Symmetry: C2
Subunit: 95 residues, 2 copies
């Protein structure tokens, strides 16, 4: 059983793909709190362009808001809204 | 606004389609050029409940894909290359 060349090529080509992103990494200022969940699923460009001079980059973006729990260890916790950047379209482009 | 329970369930440690550079899987073959240069594989991803835990595979299998294997000074052919897939994941304590 084998994935055919053109199917691999098409499926792997530069495009927005659900990507699991660490919240603190996105918001490194909030070092005092723990986020739960600690990561969020976001559409982000991924995949390849198959040309050493090209890179997969966003060409359209927007924000998405989600409810995230902020935790203060041994202290308390509260659910609030947090916004994240998402990639709506991606294209291969000169570096 | 995505509701807390949806985000928590969607983000929790599980196998996720992940686009992976072939050289990461075959670093011993950096003398080649591959097309496509990356492949879509199921790999454990997402987050565990706390920073003392990591999301690791508990079931694995192989997937075989046709890849154009190129040596610019020798030739090229479409060959089969096998890649590791993760079929199930769990959160386990980090070692260290």
């Amino acid at each position: 059983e084998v994935v055919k060349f053109m199917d691999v090529y098409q499926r792997s080509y530069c495009h927005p793909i659900e990507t699991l992103v660490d919240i603190f990494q996105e918001y490194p200022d909030e070092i005092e709190y723990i986020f739960k969940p600690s990561c969020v699923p976001l559409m982000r460009c991924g995949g390849c362009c198959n040309d050493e001079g090209l890179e997969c980059v966003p060409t359209e973006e927007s924000n998405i808001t989600m409810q995230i729990m902020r935790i203060k260890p041994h202290q308390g916790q509260h659910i609030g809204e947090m916004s994240f950047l998402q990639h709506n379209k991606c294209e291969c482009r000169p570096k």
